[PDB]
């Protein structure tokens, strides 16, 4: 039988040059796309200022306008989805993770514009939803769109171009080429059967996109925290303890995130309007908190550097934690076009920071610095929920550039999935494709 192996071995790493040359076009396109999307998202959150400041005199006139814009935007958001591509809703990844297994479709001629503009509306309005996930999906469709335009055929050219578009996307976003590749080959990639995905094609794409991004985003980071301190071996155990914690809570958060899209489903029954309305509802509720305590609203990026520094009192932290848990559920569970990827990053940071502080005093002889645990936890809720330790650890580092924390970072991210297994829990990004795949059928 090994008579074959010898041919395969001596045949390894030979990808159809034409599949490569496309991963490059995809990458470049997923890139220009991701850039533009991000830009517009901002441009809107801006106007939502030259509207607030414009009437800063009148107080209730603010609260009002900072509700109607987040409503009029969040509404226009849900709408575009419910009436044109009920798949743009939710994260935007399970539909790709499914599509890799030919279990869901890549209706790019719809999902592209829908997920784009749709998101500008939900993100530009400032809801607790990341723009990462949504970009992963925009990516895939970008890939499949060229796949169809050039009729390249055959699993490899289909699975490959589709997967490079997914990573080209998750990369041009956090500007983390490594975290991108690592994500596909650890989560996206069909989990229980060999696949015809060309690893080398991906890289070409991840780069092409990451360059396009750079072309329009140099001299600035997403999260800047500078070289925090180091972590001595005698303090390594504390990262397991924190690891366990995220572990027991990761699945629980998975319950709420799923069971909240059920309970939120009654309130509209599926009615395009009871939904769209409940849309400007949660939408507007955000634009409001997004000016009466911004920590509970918006993406949540901007507040990470400040949590790591330790500028939040233990209280304000717990407050922000709880409040965010709510706003994130209430927002993701409401089937609005937007990821729950980014927000979990915030969620973790905060929980991390807090654990830090407790520690910092409990052991004055360890000379701790809350900030380390904030980093040791920033990817921990990406480990207990979505369960992709490796992609999670690499993403953090990718953008917090603190490799001296690498050990505590893993000992935490492991204790995470090691306790999210030992206690129910499942790949939050899977359990979704589960329900959305068991609903396709089981309904006829």
């Amino acid at each position, epitope marked *: 039988r090994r008579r074959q192996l010898i041919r395969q071995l001596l045949e390894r790493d030979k990808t159809p040059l034409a599949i490569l040359f496309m991963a490059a076009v995809v990458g470049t396109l997923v890139g220009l796309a991701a850039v533009a999307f991000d830009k517009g998202v901002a441009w809107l959150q801006n106007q939502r200022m030259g509207a607030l400041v414009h009437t800063a005199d009148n107080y209730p006139l603010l609260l009002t306008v900072a509700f109607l814009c987040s409503a009029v935007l969040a509404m226009f958001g849900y709408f575009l989805v419910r009436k044109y591509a009920p798949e743009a809703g939710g994260s935007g990844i399970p539909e790709i993770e499914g599509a890799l297994e030919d279990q869901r479709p890549v209706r790019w001629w719809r999902v592209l514009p829908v997920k784009f503009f749709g998101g500008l509306g939900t993100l530009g309005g400032g809801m607790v939803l990341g723009r990462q996930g949504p970009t992963v999906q925009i990516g895939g469709n970008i890939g499949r769109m060229v796949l169809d335009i050039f009729r390249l055929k055959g699993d490899e050219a289909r699975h490959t171009l589709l997967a490079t578009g997914a990573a080209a996307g998750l990369a041009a976003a956090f500007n983390a080429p490594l975290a991108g590749i690592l994500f596909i080959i650890e989560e996206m990639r069909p989990q229980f059967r060999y696949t015809l995905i060309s690893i080398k094609a991906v890289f070409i794409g991840v780069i092409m996109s990451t360059i396009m991004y750079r072309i329009f985003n140099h001299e600035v980071a997403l999260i800047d925290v500078g070289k925090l301190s180091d972590a*001595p071996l005698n303090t390594l155990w504390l990262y397991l303890i924190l690891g366990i914690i995220f572990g027991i809570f990761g699945p629980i958060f998975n319950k709420w995130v799923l069971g909240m899209q059920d309970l939120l489903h009654r309130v509209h029954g599926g009615n395009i309007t009871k939904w769209v309305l409940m849309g400007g509802a949660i939408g507007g509720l955000c634009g409001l908190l997004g000016f009466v305590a911004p920590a509970t609203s918006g993406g949540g990026f901007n507040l990470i550097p400040i949590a790591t520094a330790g500028n939040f009192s233990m209280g304000m932290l717990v407050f922000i934690f709880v409040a965010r848990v709510i706003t994130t559920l209430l927002c993701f569970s409401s089937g609005a076009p937007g990821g729950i990827f980014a927000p979990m990053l915030a969620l973790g940071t905060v929980l991390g920071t807090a654990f830090g502080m407790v520690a910092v005093e409990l052991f004055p*002889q360890y000379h701790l*610095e809350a900030g380390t645990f904030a980093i040791a936890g920033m990817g921990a809720l990406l480990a207990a929920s979505i369960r992709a330790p490796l992609t999670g650890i690499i993403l953090v580092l990718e953008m917090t550039d603190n490799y001296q924390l690498i050990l505590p970072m893993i000992i935490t991210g492991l204790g995470a999935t090691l306790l999210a297994q030992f206690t129910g829990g499942k790949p939050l990004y899977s359990a979704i494709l589960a329900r959305t795949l068991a609903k396709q059928e089981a309904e006829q």
Partner: antibody
Framework: VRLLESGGGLVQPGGSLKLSCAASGFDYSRYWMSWVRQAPGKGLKWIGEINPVSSTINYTPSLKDKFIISRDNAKDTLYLQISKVRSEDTALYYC??????????????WGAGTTVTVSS | DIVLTQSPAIMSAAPGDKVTMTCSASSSVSYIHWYQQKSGTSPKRWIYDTSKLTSGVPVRFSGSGSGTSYSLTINTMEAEDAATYYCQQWSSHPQTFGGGTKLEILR
């Protein structure tokens, strides 16, 4: 690498003196600096310690502001302010650099140290 | 405030002799440290983490102990070992030093 601390001297009861410690031969940041004093004849007693960004400063069980340790990373210098001094404060004051092995920190590199006599 | 008390307050032994000094803790410590102090000089980090000679310490020296009681030893002490050794802990805040032991070239 040298740790040279000046400032010591003669002070009358109820006085105040700013001991200084100039560092050279290593990166002042990344380092926890501390003070320990040796009373003539007696042993050593830890005074305080101040982390890099000075976002942390601890002293031994002493009252309010008997001691006020601070540092100017811009001048790689460690400071120590003693107020309302009394004879028990007459000793040799050393500023050490702090590090660790497994993690149970030690006083890495000491300095000659300045003497402080408190008398009338 | 672990009360570290170094046993022999003062002791003398002729070079090439095997000398050992104790350092008991009132409570429980771990990874003790030792500092050598020769007349006229600020302390010098000798042994640490209970038994790690510092870069330069003659392999003549050896650390040991556990929890409640530790010790430092010199297999065949030399004359240049005359000084005062101070054991210190920081396994419990705030750190604390021992009473010190004075080694003297018995002659």
């Amino acid at each position: 690498v040298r740790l040279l601390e000046s400032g010591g001297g003669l002070v009358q009861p109820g006085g105040s003196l700013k001991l200084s410690c100039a560092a050279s031969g290593f990166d002042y940041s990344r380092y926890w600096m501390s003070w320990v004093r040796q009373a003539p004849g007696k042993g050593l007693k830890w005074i305080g310690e101040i982390n890099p960004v000075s976002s942390t400063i601890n002293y031994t069980p002493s009252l309010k502001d008997k001691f006020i340790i601070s540092r100017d990373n811009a001048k790689d210098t460690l400071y120590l302010q003693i107020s309302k001094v009394r004879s028990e404060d007459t000793a040799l004051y050393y500023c050490a650099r702090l590090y660790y092995g497994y993690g149970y920190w030690y006083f890495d590199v000491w300095g000659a140290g300045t003497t402080v006599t408190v008398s009338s | 405030d672990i009360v570290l008390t170094q046993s022999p307050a003062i002791m003398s032994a002729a070079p090439g002799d095997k000398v050992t000094m104790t350092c008991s803790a009132s409570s429980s410590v771990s990874y003790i440290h030792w500092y050598q102090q020769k007349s006229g000089t600020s302390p010098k980090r000798w042994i640490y983490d209970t038994s790690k000679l510092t870069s330069g310490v003659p392999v003549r020296f050896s650390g040991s102990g556990s929890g409640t009681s530790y010790s430092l030893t010199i297999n065949t002490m030399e004359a240049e070992d005359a000084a005062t050794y101070y054991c210190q802990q920081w396994s419990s805040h705030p750190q604390t030093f021992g009473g010190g032991t004075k080694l003297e070239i018995l002659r």
